[PDB]
Structure 1
Amino acid sequence: RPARPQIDPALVKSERPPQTGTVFNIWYNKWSGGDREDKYLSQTHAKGRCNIARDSGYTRADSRPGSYFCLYFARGICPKGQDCDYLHRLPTIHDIFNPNVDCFGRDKFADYRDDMGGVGSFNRQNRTIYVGRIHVTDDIEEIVARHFAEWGQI
């Protein structure tokens, strides 16, 4: 099957972040003249999610050997569909990558970010993710097992 579009470019137009400052800095593309606390607490919800059955399909990266997965397909915000140049698929066990890059083609680092976010490190072969800010109920183990079993092999 062809890769379906997940959202549309009418809402994947490119535009500024909302104004949190006196003046927009065009070098760093950030707002200035404001505060620091706002940035710390602001962590919004994701604008999409992807489906293996509904969204994952074939593309020009399935045509081209030795290419990477689509990061925006992983985030569920890939409006490209079949015309994306990166795979719309979960990696299998036969999908291995060199230490210098990750599965999305982004370069890995010698270190970690000090909040352990981002791409990762080739100085540690880490296969363990850390999922915080979970609402504490009793079915949390069932919910985590279901969703991450949907996201891969554990």
Structure 2
Amino acid sequence: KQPARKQIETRPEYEMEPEQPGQVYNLWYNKWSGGMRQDPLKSQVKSETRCVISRDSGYTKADKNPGSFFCLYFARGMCSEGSK
């Protein structure tokens, strides 16, 4: 019954190159291509952040709108705007 707090103060930026020798970025399909297919179920890297309702939930600007949706990023816990 208190305003919602922001979880991640920073913005996770995108910079990563798999398999340094044998990968090249693909402009059309925005993903790295070439190199070993690699296990389909291998990339899974444990998530870094985690959330619970108790310490995180609260009011936000979307509570006013009757048809508002939930944060894709609150559940995964990197909503970096808070109550805004």
Residue 4 (structure 1) aligns with: 5
Q: Which runs of 5+ in 2 are unaligned?
A: none
CA offsets 1:105-126 (integer angstroms, 9 cap, x no match): xxxxxxxxxxxxxxxxxxxxxx
Normalising by structure 2, report the TM-score: 0.80
Residues 24 and 30 in structure 1, CA contact (< 8 A), matched pair in contact too: yes
Looking at structure 2, the residues matched to 81 and 72 of structure 1 have their Cα atoms a distance apart, in angstroms, of 11
Return the structure number with greater relative CO, CA threshold 8 A, min gap 6: 2
Which stretches in structure 1 are left out of the alignment for 5+ residues?
A: 84-154
Q: Distance in 1 between matches of 2:41 and 2:35?
A: 13
Is 1:29 the counterpart of 2:27 in the alignment? no
**Length, aligned pairs only:** 81
What percentage of residue pairs aligned between the two structures are identical? 54
Q: Please name the residue that 1:47 is paired with.
A: 48
Offset of 1:14 from its aligned partner?
A: 3.0
User: C-alpha offsets along residues 66-92 of structure 1, whole Å, 9 cap, x if unaligned?
Assistant: 111111100111111011xxxxxxxxx
Q: CA deviation at 1:16?
A: 3.5
CA RMSD of aligned residues (A): 1.7
* AA of the residue aligned to 1:14: E
Take 1:39 and 1:15, find their aligned partners in 2: how far apart are those partners?
Answer: 21
| Runs of 4+ with >3 A deviation | none
Does the CA contact (< 8 Å) of 2:17 and 2:23 recur in 1?
no
